[PDB]
RNA sequence: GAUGUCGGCUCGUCGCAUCCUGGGGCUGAAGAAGGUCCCAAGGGUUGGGCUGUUCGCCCAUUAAAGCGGCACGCGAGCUGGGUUCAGAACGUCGUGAGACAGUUCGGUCUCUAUCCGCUACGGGCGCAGGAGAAUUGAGGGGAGUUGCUCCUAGUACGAG
RNA sequence: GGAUGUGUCGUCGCAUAGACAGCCAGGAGGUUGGCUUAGAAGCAGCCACCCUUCAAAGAGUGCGUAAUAGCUCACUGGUC
C-alpha cells in the first residue's frame, strides 16, 4: 500500500473528473486516472485513497500515486537521462536537436526527439535525455539505447554508464 | 529462449512471470530463459 | 471433546465436520458421535495411550481409552473410531510404541539402526498409569546387535506380552 | 519382478484397495491412488531411481509385488486363440495402496525419492508418514 | 605483465621450491624471477626444517614479492608426533593413530601469532577440533 | 444387376510437424561458418545415369534442391513399363492333369457430354421516361522467387 | 506435468518487548578442516561438520578457476 504525497510549492492540481489536470514550472501536465479511484489534497500533504482492497484496486491504487508523484517532481524539476556511447569511433554529433550516433554502421544513425523531449552531447561519446515526463524520457531513452545494444564480448554501443554488462569472453 | 512445457525456477534467481495468457521465466543468468510458449 | 449426538443416523453430521465413534467397557455402550477437528487435533497427541475427558451433550465426563480406529483409504482422512472406557484396576493390554535416543555405536560404524517392531504391546498395563511412551537403548548396538523384548526396560509393574526374544531393534548394515 | 512359477494367465476387474497398509516397514511411504496395471519394469525403474538417490541405507520397500500374467498381438491375424503369456508381468495396484515407503532418511532426503519414482509411474501418488496403527 | 588482485599462498616442504612441478608455471608465466625466492626461503627455515611451512607471497607492481615464514600446518605436526604416514578416509571406521596433550602445549605456544581465540584453554579446545576430524584421540579431560 | 488396380505423364490445389528465402531467443555464439528452439507457408524447390518403379544410389549443380493430404489426387484425361486372362520357356513341386515365394518373351485400355462444376461468348428481362456517352468502386482476381559482384570495408572482429 | 490466475476452507511459521522484502556496513580466526588425487583450499567424490572471539559471523548456498582467487548467501546493527 501506498500513501504519502509530498506536492511541493510548484505545483497546481485539478482533480477536476478523471483528468487529473496539473500545471507547474516546467509546464502544465496531465495524467488520467480512474474515477473510482477516490483522491484530492487533505491539509497540506495530498493523497490517493481508495474503496476496496485486495488486487483490482489496490494496484491501480499503487499505480496513481507513484503516478502523479512523478508529475510532481515532474513539472517540479524536469527529468534527464544520461547515456553512455562506447566503443571504437562510436560518437554523437547532432543537428538543431537531433541526436546523431556514429556507431559503426555504414551509414549514420540520426535520432530525432519528439514533441516534449531534448537532446544534448557533452563529449561525443556520452549522451543525454532531458525532459520533462518521466516516461517518454525514458520510452526513448530506450529507442538510442536500441539504435545498439552492448555487446556479450565487448558490451558496446549504448549503455546505462552504471550498466553492469559481464563479457561472455570467447576465443 | 527455452519453450519447455514443464516451467520451473532452475536458481535463486528465475523470476516465473506472467505476461499476456503466458507462463514466463526470466532469470539473471539467460540459459534459464524459460516460457511454455 | 465434547462429542453430543449419537444416532443411528448422520446426515446431520456426515456433511457437517464430525467423525463417529463408540465408547464402551461391557456396562454402557452408549452411542456416539463427536466431532472431526477436534479428536482430529486430539488422538495425534495421547494416541493409544490416551484417555480423555468425555462430557458428551448434557454433561456425563466418561474416561476411555483409544481402542482402534479407521480411517479412509484414498483419503489419509478417519471415519470412524471406538473408545474403550479406561477401567481403574486393568484394562486390557494397551499398544505401546518402541523409541530410540543417543547415537548408535553402529550409526556412524557404517550402517543403520532398524526399529524392527515400531509400536509393542505389552500384557497388563494398569489403568491410570500406562506408558504413552517407550524410550529404548540403542547405542551399545553395534554391526548386527539386535535388542528384544526380554531387553526393554519396562515401566515399573508393565508385563511384556509380546515374546521376549522377538527382535525390537537392530542396527542394519550398510548398502 | 515375475513370478517363479505359476498358472500363466489371467482375466481384469476393479474397485478401491483392500490390503495396503499405511506405516509398517519404515517411517515414511508412498501411495497409489488410482486404478493402474504397476508393470513390473515400472517399479525397478522405480527402485533403481530411490537407490542412486540413496548411496546407502537400502530401507526401500517395494510391497508390490507382479502377481499377475498378460498378453499380447503375435504380430496381427486373430485366427487362434489366446496368445503371449510372456508379453510381461503386471501387479494390479488400487487406490490408497502402499507401493513405497523409505525409512531412516531426512523428510526431504525422501521427499525426493520418491518424487523421481514417482515420475515413472502411469498414476498419481502422494507421500505419508505415521498415525498408522490397526494391526499389529 | 600483471598485477594479480589476489594473494599468492602456498605450503612449501622444508627448502625446494626449485623443480617444475612445485612452483614452475605458478610464477613463470607471471614473468619473473624465481631462483631467488628459493635461496630466501631455505635460509629463513634453517632454523625449523625438516617440515612442511607454510608461506604467504605477496606481489606488488613492481614485480617485488615478499614473504612470511609462519609455523607448520597442525595436519603435519600430528604425523609428526604420531608418527601418521598418510591421513585416513574412514576415521570413523578405523582410526589413525593417539597422542598426549603434552604435544599440543608445543603447538599453542608456537603457532601462537595465528591463534587469535582466548587464553589458553580456548586455545586449546581449537587444537583438538582439528585433531578430531583427523583421525586421533584426545587422552585424559575434565573429571576422573 | 462392377467404387478400374502399381508406376509415370498432365493438370493442379491444401496442411504444416519449413527444405530455401523473412524475423527472432539461447549457443559451449570472437568473425566468418554453424547448432538449436520460437514465429512464420508469399513464393520457390534443377537437369542427367541405373530400376516398371515408388523409393533409393549415384553425376553436376543449387538459396533449396521439404514432408504429407486430395478414392496411396488425377484412365468418361494419355500411357500401359509393372501385376492378379488365353501362348511358350526355365528352375522348382506334383506319379499326373496342373501348380508357383518365382523368373522370362508376347498379349485389341470403348468417336458421340444430358444435370452440377469449369473456361469463354451471346439472347431476354430487369435497374419507374425514351435515348448517346463518360465514370465511382462495393466487392473479386493476378502477381508475391532467388543468386552473384561492387561499394561501405580489407573496417568491426580476430594472436593471426 | 507446469505455473505468486482468482474464489472458500485447513497447517505450520515466524515475529511492536519493532521481523519480511528493500537499504548502508559486516562477515569471522583455526583451515588450502583430513581424507582423494596431476591438483581441487565452504562448492568433482569419502569422513565429519568441533574449537575460539563475538553482536556476529555455518568446516558451508550457487556462480567462478586448471586449483587460486573474486562475486553473494545462512548469522549481526541501525534507518523505516
Known amino acids: 500500500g501506498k500513501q504519502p504525497i509530498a506536492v511541493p510549492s510548484g505545483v497546481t492540481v485539478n482533480a477536476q473528473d478523471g483528468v487529473f489536470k496539473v500545471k507547474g514550472p516546467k509546464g502544465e501536465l496531465t495524467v488520467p486516472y480512474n474515477t473510482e479511484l477516490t483522491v484530492r489534497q487533505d491539509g497540506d500533504q495530498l493523497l490517493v485513497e481508495r474503496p476496496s482492497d485486495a488486487q483490482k484496486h489496490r494496484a491501480l491504487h499503487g499505480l496513481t500515486r507513484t503516478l502523479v508523484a512523478n508529475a510532481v517532481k515532474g513539472v517540479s524539476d524536469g527529468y534527464t537521462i544520461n547515456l553512455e556511447l562506447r566503443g571504437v569511433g562510436f560518437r554523437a554529433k547532432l543537428t538543431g536537436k537531433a541526436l546523431e550516433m556514429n556507431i559503426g554502421y555504414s551509414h549514420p544513425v540520426i535520432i530525432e526527439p519528439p514533441a516534449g523531449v531534448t537532446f544534448a552531447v557533452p563529449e561525443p561519446t556520452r549522451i543525454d535525455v532531458s525532459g520533462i515526463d518521466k516516461q517518454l524520457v525514458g520510452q526513448v531513452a530506450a529507442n538510442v539505447r536500441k539504435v545498439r545494444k552492448p555487446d556479450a564480448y565487448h558490451g558496446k554501443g549504448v549503455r546505462f554508464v552504471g550498466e553492469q554488462i559481464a563479457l561472455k569472453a570467447g576465443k | ?37 | 471433546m465434547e462429542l453430543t449426538a449419537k444416532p443411528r443416523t448422520p446426515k446431520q453430521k456426515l456433511d457437517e465436520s464430525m467423525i463417529a465413534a463408540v465408547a464402551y467397557n461391557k456396562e454402557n455402550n452408549v452411542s456416539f458421535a463427536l466431532d472431526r477437528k477436534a479428536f482430529d487435533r486430539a488422538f495425534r497427541q495421547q494416541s493409544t495411550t490416551g484417555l480423555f475427558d468425555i462430557t458428551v451433550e448434557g454433561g456425563e465426563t466418561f474416561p476411555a481409552l483409544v481402542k482402534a480406529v479407521q480411517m479412509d483409504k484414498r483419503k489419509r482422512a478417519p471415519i470412524h473410531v471406538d473408545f474403550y472406557m479406561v477401567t481403574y484396576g486393568e484394562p486390557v493390554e494397551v499398544s505401546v510404541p518402541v523409541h530410540t535416543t543417543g547415537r548408535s555405536q553402529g550409526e556412524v560404524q557404517g550402517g543403520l539402526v532398524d526399529i524392527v517392531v515400531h509400536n509393542l504391546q505389552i500384557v497388563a498395563p494398569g489403568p491410570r498409569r500406562i506408558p504413552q511412551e517407550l524410550v529404548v537403548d540403542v547405542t551399545k548396538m553395534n554391526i548386527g546387535d539386535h535388542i528384544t523384548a526380554g531387553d526393554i526396560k519396562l515401566p515399573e509393574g508393565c508385563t511384556l506380552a509380546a515374546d521376549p526374544e522377538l527382535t525390537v531393534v537392530s542396527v542394519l548394515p550398510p548398502r | 519382478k515375475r513370478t517363479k512359477f505359476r498358472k500363466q494367465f489371467r482375466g481384469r476387474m476393479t474397485g478401491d484397495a483392500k490390503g495396503g497398509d499405511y506405516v509398517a516397514f519404515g517411517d515414511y511411504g508412498l501411495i497409489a491412488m488410482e486404478p493402474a496395471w504397476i508393470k513390473s519394469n515400472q517399479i525397478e525403474a522405480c527402485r533403481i531411481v530411490m537407490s542412486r538417490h540413496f548411496r546407502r541405507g537400502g530401507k526401500i520397500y517395494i510391497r508390490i509385488f507382479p502377481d499377475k500374467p498378460v498378453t499380447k498381438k503375435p504380430a496381427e491375424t486373430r485366427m487362434g486363440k489366446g496368445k503371449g503369456a510372456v508379453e510381461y508381468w503386471v501387479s494390479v495396484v488400487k487406490p490408497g495402496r502402499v507401493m513405497f515407503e523409505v525409512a531412516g532418511v531426512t523428510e526431504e532426503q525422501a521427499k525426493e525419492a520418491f518424487r523421481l519414482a514417482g515420475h515413472k509411474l502411469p498414476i498419481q501418488t502422494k507421500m505419508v508418514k505415521r498415525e498408522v496403527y490397526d494391526e499389529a | 605483465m600483471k598485477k594479480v588482485a589476489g594473494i599468492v599462498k602456498l605450503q612449501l616442504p622444508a627448502g625446494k621450491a626449485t623443480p617444475a612441478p612445485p612452483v614452475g608455471p605458478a610464477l613463470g608465466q607471471y614473468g619473473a624471477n624465481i631462483m631467488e625466492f628459493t635461496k630466501a626461503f631455505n635460509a629463513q627455515t634453517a632454523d625449523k626444517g625438516d617440515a612442511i611451512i607454510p608461506v604467504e607471497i605477496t606481489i606488488y607492481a613492481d614485480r617485488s614479492f615478499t614473504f612470511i615464514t609462519k609455523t607448520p600446518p597442525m595436519s603435519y605436526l600430528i604425523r609428526k608426533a604420531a608418527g601418521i604416514g598418510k591421513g585416513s578416509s574412514t576415521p570413523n571406521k578405523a582410526k589413525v593413530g593417539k597422542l598426549n596433550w603434552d604435544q599440543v602445549l608445543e603447538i599453542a605456544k608456537t603457532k601462537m601469532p595465528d591463534l587469535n581465540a582466548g587464553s589458553v584453554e580456548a586455545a586449546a579446545n581449537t587444537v583438538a577440533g582439528t585433531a578430531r576430524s583427523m583421525g586421533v584421540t584426545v587422552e585424559g579431560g575434565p573429571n576422573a
Open chain 2, 1 to 37: 529462449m527455452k519453450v519447455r512445457s514443464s516451467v520451473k525456477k532452475m536458481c535463486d534467481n528465475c523470476k516465473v512471470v506472467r505476461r499476456h495468457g503466458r507462463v514466463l521465466v526470466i532469470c539473471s543468468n539467460v540459459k534459464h530463459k524459460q516460457r511454455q510458449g
